[PDB]
Design an enzyme around this catalytic site. Sequence first.
Site, PDB file in Angstrom:
ATOM      1  N   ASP A 171     -20.585  10.524 -27.626  1.00  0.00           N
ATOM      2  CA  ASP A 171     -20.805   9.812 -26.380  1.00  0.00           C
ATOM      3  C   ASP A 171     -21.705  10.623 -25.397  1.00  0.00           C
ATOM      4  N   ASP A 194       0.822  -1.178   0.000  1.00  0.00           N
ATOM      5  CA  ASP A 194       0.000   0.000   0.000  1.00  0.00           C
ATOM      6  C   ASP A 194       0.873   1.251   0.000  1.00  0.00           C
ATOM      7  N   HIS A 237       1.584   8.783   5.213  1.00  0.00           N
ATOM      8  CA  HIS A 237       0.586   9.795   5.558  1.00  0.00           C
ATOM      9  C   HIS A 237       1.150  10.685   6.724  1.00  0.00           C
ATOM     10  N   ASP A 277       2.369   3.092   3.165  1.00  0.00           N
ATOM     11  CA  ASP A 277       1.258   4.083   3.220  1.00  0.00           C
ATOM     12  C   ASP A 277       1.038   4.634   4.608  1.00  0.00           C
ATOM     13  N   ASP A 294     -20.647   6.652 -21.548  1.00  0.00           N
ATOM     14  CA  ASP A 294     -20.289   5.243 -21.202  1.00  0.00           C
ATOM     15  C   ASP A 294     -18.933   4.799 -21.791  1.00  0.00           C
ATOM     16  N   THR A 312      -7.027   3.504  -2.230  1.00  0.00           N
ATOM     17  CA  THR A 312      -6.688   2.135  -1.985  1.00  0.00           C
ATOM     18  C   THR A 312      -7.755   1.161  -2.471  1.00  0.00           C
ATOM     19  N   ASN A 345     -13.109   5.250  -1.590  1.00  0.00           N
ATOM     20  CA  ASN A 345     -13.097   4.606  -0.260  1.00  0.00           C
ATOM     21  C   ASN A 345     -14.410   4.917   0.522  1.00  0.00           C
TER      22      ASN A 345
HETATM   23  C1  LIG Z   1     -14.982  -2.189 -19.451  1.00  0.00           C
HETATM   24  O1  LIG Z   1     -15.269  -3.613 -19.418  1.00  0.00           O
HETATM   25  C2  LIG Z   1     -16.653  -3.909 -19.097  1.00  0.00           C
HETATM   26  C3  LIG Z   1     -16.822  -5.450 -19.072  1.00  0.00           C
HETATM   27  O2  LIG Z   1     -16.760  -5.963 -20.395  1.00  0.00           O
HETATM   28  C4  LIG Z   1     -17.648  -3.232 -20.016  1.00  0.00           C
HETATM   29  O3  LIG Z   1     -18.906  -3.314 -19.306  1.00  0.00           O
HETATM   30  C5  LIG Z   1     -19.928  -4.092 -19.915  1.00  0.00           C
HETATM   31  O4  LIG Z   1     -20.538  -3.257 -20.940  1.00  0.00           O
HETATM   32  C6  LIG Z   1     -21.814  -3.633 -21.524  1.00  0.00           C
HETATM   33  C7  LIG Z   1     -22.490  -2.360 -22.167  1.00  0.00           C
HETATM   34  O5  LIG Z   1     -22.546  -1.120 -21.326  1.00  0.00           O
HETATM   35  C8  LIG Z   1     -22.756  -4.280 -20.483  1.00  0.00           C
HETATM   36  O6  LIG Z   1     -23.768  -5.038 -21.157  1.00  0.00           O
HETATM   37  C9  LIG Z   1     -25.103  -4.840 -20.578  1.00  0.00           C
HETATM   38  O7  LIG Z   1     -25.420  -5.847 -19.589  1.00  0.00           O
HETATM   39  C10 LIG Z   1     -26.761  -5.858 -19.049  1.00  0.00           C
HETATM   40  C11 LIG Z   1     -26.906  -6.953 -17.967  1.00  0.00           C
HETATM   41  O8  LIG Z   1     -25.895  -6.726 -16.966  1.00  0.00           O
HETATM   42  C12 LIG Z   1     -25.920  -7.578 -15.785  1.00  0.00           C
HETATM   43  O9  LIG Z   1     -25.211  -8.828 -15.964  1.00  0.00           O
HETATM   44  C13 LIG Z   1     -23.776  -8.707 -16.194  1.00  0.00           C
HETATM   45  C14 LIG Z   1     -23.101 -10.076 -16.451  1.00  0.00           C
HETATM   46  O10 LIG Z   1     -22.978 -10.897 -15.259  1.00  0.00           O
HETATM   47  C15 LIG Z   1     -23.131  -7.926 -15.015  1.00  0.00           C
HETATM   48  O11 LIG Z   1     -21.711  -7.740 -15.182  1.00  0.00           O
HETATM   49  C16 LIG Z   1     -23.808  -6.551 -14.803  1.00  0.00           C
HETATM   50  O12 LIG Z   1     -23.099  -5.824 -13.751  1.00  0.00           O
HETATM   51  C17 LIG Z   1     -23.330  -4.381 -13.678  1.00  0.00           C
HETATM   52  O13 LIG Z   1     -24.444  -4.046 -12.840  1.00  0.00           O
HETATM   53  C18 LIG Z   1     -24.309  -4.402 -11.447  1.00  0.00           C
HETATM   54  C19 LIG Z   1     -25.537  -3.879 -10.704  1.00  0.00           C
HETATM   55  O14 LIG Z   1     -26.714  -4.189 -11.456  1.00  0.00           O
HETATM   56  C20 LIG Z   1     -23.030  -3.829 -10.801  1.00  0.00           C
HETATM   57  O15 LIG Z   1     -22.754  -4.470  -9.544  1.00  0.00           O
HETATM   58  C21 LIG Z   1     -21.779  -3.979 -11.668  1.00  0.00           C
HETATM   59  O16 LIG Z   1     -20.699  -3.195 -11.070  1.00  0.00           O
HETATM   60  C22 LIG Z   1     -22.102  -3.600 -13.139  1.00  0.00           C
HETATM   61  O17 LIG Z   1     -22.379  -2.173 -13.171  1.00  0.00           O
HETATM   62  C23 LIG Z   1     -21.793  -1.462 -14.301  1.00  0.00           C
HETATM   63  O18 LIG Z   1     -22.440  -1.775 -15.572  1.00  0.00           O
HETATM   64  C24 LIG Z   1     -23.838  -1.340 -15.671  1.00  0.00           C
HETATM   65  C25 LIG Z   1     -24.459  -1.836 -17.001  1.00  0.00           C
HETATM   66  O19 LIG Z   1     -24.643  -3.280 -16.983  1.00  0.00           O
HETATM   67  C26 LIG Z   1     -23.937   0.198 -15.427  1.00  0.00           C
HETATM   68  O20 LIG Z   1     -25.295   0.694 -15.477  1.00  0.00           O
HETATM   69  C27 LIG Z   1     -23.251   0.605 -14.098  1.00  0.00           C
HETATM   70  O21 LIG Z   1     -23.141   2.022 -13.989  1.00  0.00           O
HETATM   71  C28 LIG Z   1     -21.824   0.056 -13.998  1.00  0.00           C
HETATM   72  O22 LIG Z   1     -20.992   0.815 -14.909  1.00  0.00           O
HETATM   73  C29 LIG Z   1     -25.332  -6.771 -14.595  1.00  0.00           C
HETATM   74  O23 LIG Z   1     -25.587  -7.430 -13.339  1.00  0.00           O
HETATM   75  C30 LIG Z   1     -27.754  -6.016 -20.209  1.00  0.00           C
HETATM   76  O24 LIG Z   1     -29.083  -6.008 -19.665  1.00  0.00           O
HETATM   77  C31 LIG Z   1     -27.563  -4.903 -21.268  1.00  0.00           C
HETATM   78  O25 LIG Z   1     -28.476  -5.084 -22.401  1.00  0.00           O
HETATM   79  C32 LIG Z   1     -29.336  -3.949 -22.794  1.00  0.00           C
HETATM   80  O26 LIG Z   1     -28.878  -3.305 -24.002  1.00  0.00           O
HETATM   81  C33 LIG Z   1     -28.986  -4.147 -25.173  1.00  0.00           C
HETATM   82  C34 LIG Z   1     -28.219  -3.570 -26.363  1.00  0.00           C
HETATM   83  O27 LIG Z   1     -27.561  -4.636 -27.066  1.00  0.00           O
HETATM   84  C35 LIG Z   1     -30.462  -4.384 -25.492  1.00  0.00           C
HETATM   85  O28 LIG Z   1     -30.641  -5.188 -26.670  1.00  0.00           O
HETATM   86  C36 LIG Z   1     -31.099  -5.096 -24.308  1.00  0.00           C
HETATM   87  O29 LIG Z   1     -32.502  -5.188 -24.574  1.00  0.00           O
HETATM   88  C37 LIG Z   1     -30.826  -4.367 -22.974  1.00  0.00           C
HETATM   89  O30 LIG Z   1     -31.725  -3.223 -22.914  1.00  0.00           O
HETATM   90  C38 LIG Z   1     -32.827  -3.340 -21.962  1.00  0.00           C
HETATM   91  O31 LIG Z   1     -32.516  -2.732 -20.695  1.00  0.00           O
HETATM   92  C39 LIG Z   1     -32.334  -1.295 -20.748  1.00  0.00           C
HETATM   93  C40 LIG Z   1     -31.878  -0.801 -19.368  1.00  0.00           C
HETATM   94  O32 LIG Z   1     -32.802  -1.210 -18.346  1.00  0.00           O
HETATM   95  C41 LIG Z   1     -33.621  -0.598 -21.266  1.00  0.00           C
HETATM   96  O33 LIG Z   1     -33.469   0.826 -21.391  1.00  0.00           O
HETATM   97  C42 LIG Z   1     -34.040  -1.173 -22.628  1.00  0.00           C
HETATM   98  O34 LIG Z   1     -35.192  -0.429 -23.157  1.00  0.00           O
HETATM   99  C43 LIG Z   1     -34.149  -2.726 -22.479  1.00  0.00           C
HETATM  100  O35 LIG Z   1     -35.148  -3.197 -21.546  1.00  0.00           O
HETATM  101  C44 LIG Z   1     -26.092  -4.843 -21.739  1.00  0.00           C
HETATM  102  O36 LIG Z   1     -25.701  -5.942 -22.571  1.00  0.00           O
HETATM  103  C45 LIG Z   1     -22.106  -5.195 -19.439  1.00  0.00           C
HETATM  104  O37 LIG Z   1     -23.028  -5.469 -18.365  1.00  0.00           O
HETATM  105  C46 LIG Z   1     -20.933  -4.492 -18.817  1.00  0.00           C
HETATM  106  N1  LIG Z   1     -20.320  -5.304 -17.746  1.00  0.00           N
HETATM  107  C47 LIG Z   1     -19.757  -4.803 -16.651  1.00  0.00           C
HETATM  108  C48 LIG Z   1     -19.122  -5.782 -15.687  1.00  0.00           C
HETATM  109  O38 LIG Z   1     -19.688  -3.622 -16.369  1.00  0.00           O
HETATM  110  C49 LIG Z   1     -17.277  -1.760 -20.224  1.00  0.00           C
HETATM  111  O39 LIG Z   1     -18.172  -1.225 -21.257  1.00  0.00           O
HETATM  112  C50 LIG Z   1     -15.800  -1.574 -20.558  1.00  0.00           C
HETATM  113  N2  LIG Z   1     -15.516  -0.150 -20.687  1.00  0.00           N
HETATM  114  C51 LIG Z   1     -14.986   0.402 -21.811  1.00  0.00           C
HETATM  115  C52 LIG Z   1     -14.867   1.898 -21.772  1.00  0.00           C
HETATM  116  O40 LIG Z   1     -14.646  -0.248 -22.786  1.00  0.00           O
HETATM  117 CA   LIG Z   2      -3.614   2.298  -0.711  1.00  0.00          CA
HETATM  118 CA   LIG Z   3     -22.035   6.114 -25.605  1.00  0.00          CA
HETATM  119 ZN   LIG Z   4      -3.251   5.992   2.096  1.00  0.00          ZN
END
Ligand SMILES: *[C@@H]1O[C@H](CO)[C@@H](O[C@@H]2O[C@H](CO)[C@@H](O[C@@H]3O[C@H](CO[C@H]4O[C@H](CO)[C@@H](O)[C@H](O[C@H]5O[C@H](CO)[C@@H](O)[C@H](O)[C@@H]5O[C@H]5O[C@H](CO)[C@@H](O)[C@H](O)[C@@H]5O)[C@@H]4O)[C@@H](O)[C@H](O[C@H]4O[C@H](CO)[C@@H](O)[C@H](O)[C@@H]4O[C@H]4O[C@H](CO)[C@@H](O)[C@H](O)[C@@H]4O)[C@@H]3O)[C@H](O)[C@H]2NC(C)=O)[C@H](O)[C@H]1NC(C)=O
Ligand SMILES: [Ca+2]
Ligand SMILES: [Ca+2]
Ligand SMILES: [Zn+2]
Length: 805
Positions: A683, A121, A265, A261, A687, A159, A180
Amino acid sequence: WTATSGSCKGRCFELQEVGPPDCRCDNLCKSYSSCCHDFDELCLKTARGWECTKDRCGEVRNEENACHCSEDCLSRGDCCTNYQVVCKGESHWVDDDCEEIKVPECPAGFVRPPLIIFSVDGFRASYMKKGSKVMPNIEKLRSCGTHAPYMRPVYPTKTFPNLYTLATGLYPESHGIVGNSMYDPVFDASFHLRGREKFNHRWWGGQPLWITATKQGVRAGTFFWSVSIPHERRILTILQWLSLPDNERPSVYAFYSEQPDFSGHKYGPFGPEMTNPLREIDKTVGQLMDGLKQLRLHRCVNVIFVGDHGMEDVTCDRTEFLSNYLTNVDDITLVPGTLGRIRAKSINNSKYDPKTIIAALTCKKPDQHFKPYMKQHLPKRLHYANNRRIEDIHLLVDRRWHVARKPLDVYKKCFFQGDHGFDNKVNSMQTVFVGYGPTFKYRTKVPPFENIELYNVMCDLLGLKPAPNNGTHGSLNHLLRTNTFRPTMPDEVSRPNYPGIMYLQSEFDLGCTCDDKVENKLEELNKRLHTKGSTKERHLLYGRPAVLYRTSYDILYHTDFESGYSEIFLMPLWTSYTISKQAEVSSIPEHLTNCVRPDVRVSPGFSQNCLAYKNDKQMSYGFLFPPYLSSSPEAKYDAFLVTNMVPMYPAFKRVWAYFQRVLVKKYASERNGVNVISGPIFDYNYDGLRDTEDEIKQYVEGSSIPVPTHYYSIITSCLDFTQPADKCDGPLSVSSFILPHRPDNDESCNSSEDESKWVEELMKMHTARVRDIEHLTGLDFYRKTSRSYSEILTLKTYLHTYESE
Ligand SMILES: *[C@@H]1O[C@H](CO)[C@@H](O[C@@H]2O[C@H](CO)[C@@H](O[C@@H]3O[C@H](CO[C@H]4O[C@H](CO)[C@@H](O)[C@H](O[C@H]5O[C@H](CO)[C@@H](O)[C@H](O)[C@@H]5O[C@H]5O[C@H](CO)[C@@H](O)[C@H](O)[C@@H]5O)[C@@H]4O)[C@@H](O)[C@H](O[C@H]4O[C@H](CO)[C@@H](O)[C@H](O)[C@@H]4O[C@H]4O[C@H](CO)[C@@H](O)[C@H](O)[C@@H]4O)[C@@H]3O)[C@H](O)[C@H]2NC(C)=O)[C@H](O)[C@H]1NC(C)=O
Ligand SMILES: [Ca+2]
Ligand SMILES: [Ca+2]
Ligand SMILES: [Zn+2]
Ligand SMILES: Cc1nnn(Cc2cc(C(F)(F)F)ccc2CCC(=O)N2CCN(C(=O)c3ccc(S(N)(=O)=O)cc3)CC2)n1
Ligand SMILES: [Cl-]
Ligand code: NA
Ligand code: NA
């Protein structure tokens, strides 16, 4: 409730966690107040300390001792780490010469080389050189294995976000641990370092390495340690797990140290008190290595020595107070320190307004030591907006400073001399990476890289398929002797059209004019050749970018530039051109100041129009290929085609014009030619991913012309600057940017001055990786080079940071 009347007898540091109300004996039981009644007695022995001495050699076993020096200790797996040195005439690992590990040299029954992650750390990158004289074990790891001069952490440089990014390969906005301290408005719950809410799994997204391992049949040590377990007991516990039977033994392990760490501090990054914590961490690495040597594992295990973030000088007197800016300071909640996050104190206050808070925080004091942003306006490189836990208003704090709400927050809490959390390109925030073992290379220096890439590599080291993550798999193949991951280029989804001359001038009714009616068999065939791609090898040096989604576009050739023109977005997706060292800059001639020309290869219905810009009083236009860099007066006419125009706010055109008229030529002179690829980005949902047409929130008034949120450029040249960009035999060199397309220059406090005093400073802040642009556009660059694909992947993850050494 816990029934602490159970026993830890034969269960000390058990790997499967048992469920309440049953009492626990695992390395986290203390943190939940759940250990059985006899855990200290049985599992945390301290009798006689941590080292064998001459008199103890051969002793009759006493089960009370912290560790053993009896003849049976090697077969029980519980000798003190210095046993063979003190009692059997062996050397410490650190005193042995380094010898290349060409193959794993593992005991029978070992299915794969184990991985041990040794995490520290607050270990600032420069400690590896500045502390080298007091860290002999660490210096041997570094010099004999594979090392980077530094590793870049993720923002915020705190961290919890960084350790979870190391574990998952994800940006904080995706994994959920965005600080944090956090408030989640959907849960209506708060996460804090102290307290119980942090244990609830709903906070923690993605899939961390220990889970990835377990799901694919690879057993894992438990990674977290309760703070009161001493380091010496953490090391003994790892060494004991390594003596388990084959079917019970983990393949992946983590150690964690709260130092340096904790002291940093109190004392600052280079306080004289910092020598002793560095000596102590080195002594712990020595214990581990000596321990591995005893078990005949020192040429079998892969060891990673890695930090979460660095440490800067920060004192209480360098604090900015929001009470010196805002009238309404009691109506806000601030998450304070080395970053600021602001939201309303009450959701029932309909007089809360983010616009008024931002304006009151903008360029108000001459030496102001923070800058406010709406989160979507933060540099795209920070990838810090797409999460409901990140407040809309953010403060980026200068290195060495703090922000707080009111002065009483700072003395009703000077104590401290160091802190961290700032922008992840800041030199003092950089941290460490060393890899040592049979799968890593020998005596090899690698360039700096980002911590989001390590998850993939750790998966490679263990034979695991990574969960979907933000690393670029293959970009760190140059760190590894074997187990490299050999990716294939993505397939092109949309092929281009190659239009010829298909429309007469009078078919267009675009409201544009140009003074171009000025009239030869020699030169006519030649200009026809330019329109069919005769100069394309000069201007498109690395192949055309591949389009990785379904759309309709045209390739357009010209004397000085090539473009991929979108019939859906009414503008180029990309525009590619090469500027040699010898190129000359010219003006836009007087007669051509307002010239825009129909493109007889593209239908009126798929073209922009000038009348829309006339009627939109907020919006103007610019050009992707710059008229300033035309090869000749005759070629310059091509730069005013309607198919080269893009919508630009007047305030943004100040920035863009200076980039194109002054800075492109400067870079060509300095780098011995440059190739430039420029284009728009959309964008609107912040996202980090290319918007579809139905996500666009703003158009040029009265039209279907969409307004970009950003403009990019990718600037490539030869790494060996003795060869010109267009005749390069070897590796490439790149810098890129993603500029916000904003209607004011409020971000730049010196914008009333000449562009020579502020534009390049803006561009440096918005520096980018090629990969960032790929995500934002659905394009795939560098498809046709002479270079290996892994080398190109490394190139695409490079960030030009503009920090001194
Ligand atoms: C960095 O790497 C990551 C990993 O590859 C990239 O993130 C992925 O990007 C995808 C697009 O944004 C995304 O795909 C979506 O998944 C939806 C289902 O997700 C659940 O299941 C997965 C798999 O286990 C899980 O990982 C998800 O986890 C997220 O949410 C939980 C809480 O719910 C959090 O604990 C977790 O931290 C994570 O949050 C993050 O991601 C979400 C988005 O999922 C954000 O909102 C958060 O802020 C946070 O950043 C979930 O548990 C799936 O439902 C989506 O599909 C919709 O869109 C398609 C388009 O093809 C459409 O056809 C479908 O119909 C559907 O739309 C419907 O729902 C809409 C919303 O309600 C609605 O408006 C419509 O009208 C429809 O009803 C979609 O496929 C994928 O989940 C994430 N994965 C992760 C881990 O983040 C990331 O993009 C990379 N970054 C870069 C810059 O490259
Ligand atoms: Ca740290
Ligand atoms: Ca976008
Ligand atoms: Zn520290
Ligand atoms: C966060 C996080 N995410 N993933 N991991 C595991 C992980 C991942 C990786 C890795 F391999 F990924 F590098 C390496 C190592 C680990 C284990 C980390 C670990 O043991 N903890 C470190 C962070 N801690 C604290 O800062 C802390 C301080 C004080 C209190 S208190 N006493 O005031 O309540 C509580 C908590 C607790 C211990 N930690
Ligand atoms: Cl307890
Ligand atoms: Na206008
Ligand atoms: Na300004």
